[PDB]
Amino acid sequence: MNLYTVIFINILLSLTLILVAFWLPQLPFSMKFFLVAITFLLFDLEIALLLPLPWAIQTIKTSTMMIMAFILVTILSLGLAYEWTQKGLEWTE
Amino acid sequence: MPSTFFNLTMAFSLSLLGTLMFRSHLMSTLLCLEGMVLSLFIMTSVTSLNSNSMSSMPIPITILVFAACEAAVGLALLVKVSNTYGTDYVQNLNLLQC
Amino acid sequence: MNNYIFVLSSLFLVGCLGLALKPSLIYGGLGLIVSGFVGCLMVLGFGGSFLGLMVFLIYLGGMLVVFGYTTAMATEEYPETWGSNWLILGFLVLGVIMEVFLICVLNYYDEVGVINLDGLGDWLMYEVDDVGVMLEGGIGVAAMYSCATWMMVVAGWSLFAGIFIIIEITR
Amino acid sequence: MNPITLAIIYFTIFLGPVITMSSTNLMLMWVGLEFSLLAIIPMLINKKNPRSTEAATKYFVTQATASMIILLAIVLNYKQLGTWMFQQQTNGLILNMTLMALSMKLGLAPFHFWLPEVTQGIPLHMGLILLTWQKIAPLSILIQIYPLLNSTIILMLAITSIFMGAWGGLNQTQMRKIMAYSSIAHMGWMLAILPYNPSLTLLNLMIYIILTAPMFMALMLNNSMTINSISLLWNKTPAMLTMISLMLLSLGGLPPLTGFLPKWIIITELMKNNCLIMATLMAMMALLNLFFYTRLIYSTSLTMFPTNNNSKMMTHQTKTKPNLMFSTLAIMSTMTLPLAPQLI
Amino acid sequence: PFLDIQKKLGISLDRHFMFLSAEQPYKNAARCHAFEKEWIECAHGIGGTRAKKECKIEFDDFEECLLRYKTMRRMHDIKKQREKLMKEGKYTPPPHHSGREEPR
Amino acid sequence: PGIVELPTLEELKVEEVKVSSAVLKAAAHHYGAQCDKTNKEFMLCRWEEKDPRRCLKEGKLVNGCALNFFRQIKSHCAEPFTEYWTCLDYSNMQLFRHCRQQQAKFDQCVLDKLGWVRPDLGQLSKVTKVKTDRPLPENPYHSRARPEPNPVIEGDLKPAKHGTRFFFWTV
Amino acid sequence: RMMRWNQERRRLLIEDLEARIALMPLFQAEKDRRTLQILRENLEEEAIIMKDVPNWKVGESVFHTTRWVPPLIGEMYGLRTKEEMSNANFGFTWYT
Amino acid sequence: GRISAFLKNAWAKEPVLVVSFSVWGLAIIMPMISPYTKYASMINKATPYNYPVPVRDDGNMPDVPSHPQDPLGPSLDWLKNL
Amino acid sequence: MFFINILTLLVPILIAMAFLTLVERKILGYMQLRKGPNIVGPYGILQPFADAMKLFMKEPSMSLFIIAPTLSLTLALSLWVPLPMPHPLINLNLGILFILATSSLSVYSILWSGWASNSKYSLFGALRAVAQTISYEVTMAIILLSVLLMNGSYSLQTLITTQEHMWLLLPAWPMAMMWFISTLAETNRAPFDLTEGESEEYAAGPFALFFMAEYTNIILMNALTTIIFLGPLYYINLPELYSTNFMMEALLLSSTFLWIRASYPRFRYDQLMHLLWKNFLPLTLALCMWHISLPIFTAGVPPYM
């Protein structure tokens, strides 16, 4: 109930402000952008994979979590470096 | 649980209809695909947290990642199409029938 | 606040229905964002805090953002609006009436199956560890780092390949 | 497509099915399917021409709907029982949906009107894979779950594929589309036999592959993708005919060749199980496949069509593309009937 | 399965959580652990068609534990009859059900 | 199909402790050893038999022991124990950090007047056998017999007979 | 310093969990007796509620097991009020 | 000499990558070195997030103790002596 | 009670945002050697209300037109809910992830404004700013994912008991040097304010709302820094002291933003995305791996209550 109250309050306050505002007075493509959005996705997915460490760490297979983390990070960096070398981060058309 | 679950399955069926019938666009189809995926992820997480099962939770994450990548390549194809024809319509693909 | 889950469910239904009745994409994306919001709220009401917030952070912030991005930069809502939205709105109304009466019909034949209406609030949580720590979905999703490593490596490879695939496509 | 990308994509394609099979979890199966889909699309769209892009859109859309449907099936099974695997206690609607999806993913009919267009938009060295390393995992899934299937709709689907593929092949000149229809028909034969003895589907698939791959090699040779462009083989390279004719008659399924054996032992099983009527329909409608193979035999070998002068400038040259495995598979297809028992 | 590479190597990658009652991380057992542990033990050593008919007394109970269709219906009929009684004017819910009690 | 047994409200009616969580969490450590035999035996009964309706006579003993424990703590050293929980309950999570120099005092009082010694670190998270007098059952799941395996076929594996038995493809 | 502090935090955690350990048995027994009384009351009422119908039973275990069964909050609080049913379901999930 | 020259160049041209790779190496390498690593697994095994169900004494097992505060069980004193 | 607390949480922060606009004007003037507003009232404590009245006096798809600013402002205000000061209004495990979500969303408003305005000119800058914001929010999230391993819980209370002895800056300053910068991008402040630098559609009212939310996000990110990397003193008897030190450090950061806005030039978009993709992301990944290894080759593996 509490967050409901707070959110309804904030929305109603903003709408009071805007109603006051309204009453008181009376294209081609750029492949680079799509590539950047795609990089953003393929990183958010890594983030979803990577967040759970604060609970995966308190387990007993440290030799496994340490490894898998290094693996994800390094392969992601490899893909990043390949994108760079193949000029996905240059912006000159 | 059963009520909401049947309703989620209905939503999946509706996205199915949305994908299997067009209105002269392609982004609509892809968005209906995303709706399917959302309903599925939800039903799976619900089943898990209702059974109190844990080891089966990685599955929603997996399929969500795969749907992200799938829709990404689909958008790339849509974009190539728009940039080689002039728009993202559907009736332009009258080729290949010969 | 007993009808909570049923309401969220009907709203997700309606979002997917507004996507199936393909409207103008600008007024369909709002339906999709609403759908995601309500589905996450359902998950949360069940108890998957981590999953709900993961959704808010990835689905919306990651996928719908780029959907709108690509759409705008690569689409034009040509004047196909011969009151198409104003027609499919009444069509949606008719469909929702159909569905309301459909459920009011079903509840007669099926009572303890499809839906239990007199006791709807019941039958969401079945058991729970009252005195138990470490029972949140965070642990199940963390599994991948100790057991079920195959999931993590497979997703990693999916991205490792999607990068190359997208770039080799766009050219 | 630089070498690193080429290698990674080929790896993912060789992986998707391996996982889809070696995994006992339906989620991993679906994952391998998505792997194949993704890693393949580029190889289709490399030329970046409009036709390739269109075919890619079609392929991706259909296979996406299919994968999502299979996922729905798996999740319903989860809610029903708890296990991520199929058991003998699943409401048959789920199996029927799984089957519709697997079909649309293969090319069976009436879910098949997307295969010819795509296979016409594609080059050869990718249509080959599309037909011979994407119809495996979807078939392993069935190999796992054959007992509890719906023979009724399986048979209706198979025979529908037979009819429609044959009737379309009577007309299509484009050799790519012809091969596609042949694939449809043979996969129909498989799905027809499947719930009785799976090894026989395995056999039909391996045979269709061994007959297809070398044909596509002989095509890759010249990029001759038309009847009036392949009839000139007797003046460009008069050697491939004595094997192409055989391989096409085989694909038809003429007794002394090997392509017959599958239909033969399949009919045997269906007669043991009292399905002689559909067996008769299949056997009396493979003759149209045989027909539109004979009609290409004619064009190529049994009669010589008007050539084109510059073929002399060609003959002055040489060519050493046609590797050994082509002939090897051609022979181990045509002249291996005496070794059917050692095949079963 | 199809290609028993896993069993050949004597390893496991996915098949250790193929079902419900596998080893959960912090020993938190699932809902129908026992019914699963009995269904599996009856469906082991034998294959398929034997189990689809000689394990029903062990599988229907499981499906009920998992869904509780019959319990839902039981409670539903109870509450329907109770409502009808409080309508006709014959029932009088006591306190322990009506809103208070002397709890622990 | 089948009746269920149950005890009666009028029985199993013992006078509970009704004490607060702060006090329990504060006094626990000593109660970890004092009144440990009974509690361990009860947990063993509950883990062996899944019948709370059979593991009851080991609960009234538990509560009686806990009460005869709080009774000694009421007789001796009461005010240190009251100020203690009033210092704990102030915080939110009721941690043992914000009350250190209000704890050792109570401990030394309890000691100088009684032969208790606050357990050390990691002394309760250890399996300790418990000598009892009642037996252990089998078939606690009330399971049923395991239907017999398939009678195995055996015998020296000699070759085929007359060949593959296939159509005139003798060898 | 971060290390030397994290280790002390782990020690405090062990202390708290040891307290919980020592107290679990009591709580287990209280909870058991409480749910048993709950079911007994549901039964003593069910009797009079559904005695006037044909071929209906009293505490009919829907299984064929004889095994004890963790009961559902549905069963237990199914006759009490929405107040309690929700204070059970959405208690930890609605921020205390 | 070529290596030294290349690094003397990079340490002015593009240090960011140098820092990144050095950090990466340190991370992959130190865990194999330090002595205080296994202690982490020992700890997270000690931490009792659940209840230690006891056992009977129908045998002659002398290891397990009849009481918590007794010394016959697995100790961890090194934890506080750390 | 609760409504009273929400008022205490919403009214004073609007007051502070107004007087923060004021403080900006004054400090920029004093760094450019001029005074700043000293006239409308004593030392300029009425110019903000003057601006409010003026804007609401100015004349001007209604759907987007309204939902965009409303959405942004509501998100910016809700961001405050879960903060500890020292005991929060809403204690939420995963609070910082809720923060990140509700901070990223406003991109939807930025984007709807463009997709409504047919001006190619507008879509140009809209895409540019959206992309930069996205790309910096990525690292804004990874920094937390790499630090919070010090307290094995996404909560925001545990930060305090952690920092009881020491702060979080003496370590992790390779991050603070970033978390104190990305905050200058998500906010579209300087030196990354190109979204307001190159102009060739916000009316008065919606502009007021956008600016309100902008400066609210300023205050809030500065508070997040003061809580995460600059742990205050949590002596349980002095929540007042906690709040006071928090106030001080928040003001300090909010004046540092202004030092910056005055001193530095603006970044060319390409140079900016280069900065991120080729200086911060490699470092960020490597430092995350570093802080992942630290609790393994050191005993410092933290708990989860």
Side-chain angles (χ1 to χ4, degrees), chain D residues 59-284:
Chain D
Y59 184 71
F60 169 91
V61 180
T62 69
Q63 297 210 341
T65 68
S67 313
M68 304 297 167
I69 277 170
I70 301 155
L71 192 60
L72 182 83
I74 301 155
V75 173
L76 260 60
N77 198 68
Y78 194 112
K79 168 170 91 86
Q80 193 168 324
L81 320 179
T83 77
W84 282 110
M85 195 65 185
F86 284 164
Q87 311 302 155
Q88 303 202 290
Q89 306 90 318
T90 70
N91 287 359
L93 183 68
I94 279 158
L95 312 169
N96 311 336
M97 267 185 289
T98 287
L99 192 63
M100 295 189 297
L102 273 298
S103 68
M104 171 198 315
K105 180 72 170 64
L106 295 189
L108 268 60
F111 302 70
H112 69 279
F113 295 116
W114 61 263
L115 198 53
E117 309 178 345
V118 162
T119 308
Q120 175 54 297
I122 301 155
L124 277 298
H125 79 80
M126 291 328 303
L128 170 44
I129 286 161
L130 188 76
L131 306 201
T132 71
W133 200 257
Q134 302 280 126
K135 326 259 195 294
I136 278 165
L139 284 184
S140 64
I141 291 171
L142 309 159
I143 298 282
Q144 299 220 321
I145 74 172
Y146 67 101
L148 53 86
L149 283 166
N150 206 29
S151 196
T152 285
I153 68 179
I154 282 173
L155 295 199
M156 288 200 101
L157 277 168
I159 183 174
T160 287
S161 53
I162 302 294
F163 296 166
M164 283 172 160
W167 291 342
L170 288 182
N171 191 350
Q172 299 301 157
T173 82
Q174 313 307 77
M175 286 187 52
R176 276 165 300 200
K177 285 158 95 71
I178 293 170
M179 294 280 181
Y181 286 162
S182 75
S183 200
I184 279 176
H186 283 91
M187 278 151 193
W189 272 104
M190 310 203 262
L191 264 291
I193 182 54
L194 174 52
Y196 304 111
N197 207 333
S199 174
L200 318 185
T201 61
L202 270 165
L203 194 66
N204 209 353
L205 160 63
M206 294 302 319
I207 293 282
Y208 158 57
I209 282 154
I210 279 172
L211 304 184
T212 286
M215 290 307 312
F216 282 39
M217 291 202 166
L219 301 199
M220 293 150 65
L221 187 75
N222 299 106
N223 283 115
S224 312
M225 321 156 296
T226 302
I227 315 186
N228 316 325
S229 178
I230 191 171
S231 70
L232 319 182
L233 208 65
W234 65 257
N235 171 287
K236 276 183 238 158
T237 53
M240 263 76 63
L241 322 181
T242 64
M243 210 51 38
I244 288 168
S245 90
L246 299 168
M247 286 216 286
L248 302 205
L249 294 172
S250 166
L251 272 175
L254 202 69
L257 315 183
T258 315
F260 164 78
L261 170 63
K263 305 160 181 41
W264 179 67
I265 183 62
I266 290 165
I267 293 163
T268 301
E269 286 300 327
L270 278 73
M271 295 291 172
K272 294 171 160 187
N273 288 275
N274 299 296
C275 206
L276 71 168
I277 180 163
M278 298 284 171
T280 297
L281 293 202
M282 301 168 199
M284 290 169 77

Side-chain angles (χ1 to χ4, degrees), chain A residues 10-27:
Chain A
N10 295 21
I11 295 168
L12 270 300
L13 162 58
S14 313
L15 302 162
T16 59
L17 268 71
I18 199 173
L19 289 157
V20 169
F22 264 55
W23 164 51
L24 258 187
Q26 78 98 42
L27 173 52

Side-chain angles (χ1 to χ4, degrees), chain I residues 226 241-255:
Chain I
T226 62
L241 184 69
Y242 182 92
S243 281
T244 296
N245 167 35
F246 160 92
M247 162 277 276
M248 293 172 33
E249 286 167 13
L251 298 203
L252 266 294
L253 272 301
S254 305
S255 78

Side-chain angles (χ1 to χ4, degrees), chain B residues 4-31:
Chain B
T4 175
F5 204 101
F6 172 67
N7 293 37
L8 296 171
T9 312
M10 280 177 61
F12 187 90
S13 74
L14 299 191
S15 296
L16 193 76
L17 305 177
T19 50
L20 297 176
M21 317 183 65
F22 281 40
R23 304 293 141 69
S24 72
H25 267 291
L26 200 63
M27 257 298 317
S28 87
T29 283
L30 303 187
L31 279 153

Side-chain angles (χ1 to χ4, degrees), chain F residues 32-33 36 39-40 43-44 47-48 117-136, chain H residues 46-48 51-58 61-62 64-77 79-80:
Chain F
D36 68 343
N39 313 338
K40 294 309 189 203
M43 293 321 290
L44 176 67
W47 274 93
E48 289 180 352
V117 55
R118 159 153 189 275
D120 301 67
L121 168 56
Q123 290 206 272
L124 298 177
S125 69
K126 65 186 287 183
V127 302
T128 179
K129 86 199 163 299
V130 63
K131 175 156 281 288
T132 194
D133 315 330
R134 64 179 283 258
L136 76 165
Chain H
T47 42
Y51 193 119
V53 162
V55 309
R56 320 175 65 76
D57 192 342
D58 82 327
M61 62 183 75
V64 74
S66 63
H67 200 276
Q69 210 156 26
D70 291 358
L72 288 73
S75 169
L76 74 166
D77 66 337
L79 182 51
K80 303 198 309 313

Side-chain angles (χ1 to χ4, degrees), chain B:
Chain B
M1 232 304 259
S3 59
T4 175
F5 204 101
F6 172 67
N7 293 37
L8 296 171
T9 312
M10 280 177 61
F12 187 90
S13 74
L14 299 191
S15 296
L16 193 76
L17 305 177
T19 50
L20 297 176
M21 317 183 65
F22 281 40
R23 304 293 141 69
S24 72
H25 267 291
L26 200 63
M27 257 298 317
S28 87
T29 283
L30 303 187
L31 279 153
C32 295
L33 265 73
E34 283 280 13
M36 302 166 140
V37 161
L38 175 44
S39 72
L40 299 191
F41 157 90
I42 281 160
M43 291 203 315
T44 293
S45 57
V46 172
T47 56
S48 298
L49 310 158
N50 170 305
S51 307
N52 307 0
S53 194
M54 292 300 196
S55 56
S56 290
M57 221 171 291
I59 307 313
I61 301 314
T62 302
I63 69 188
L64 194 84
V65 171
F66 280 115
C69 315
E70 184 171 26
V73 304
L75 290 159
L77 294 164
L78 184 162
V79 162
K80 271 305 315 181
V81 169
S82 182
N83 283 16
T84 191
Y85 280 78
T87 182
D88 62 70
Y89 263 105
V90 192
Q91 298 86 43
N92 304 148
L93 303 179
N94 194 22
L95 324 173
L96 305 167
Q97 60 171 47
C98 313

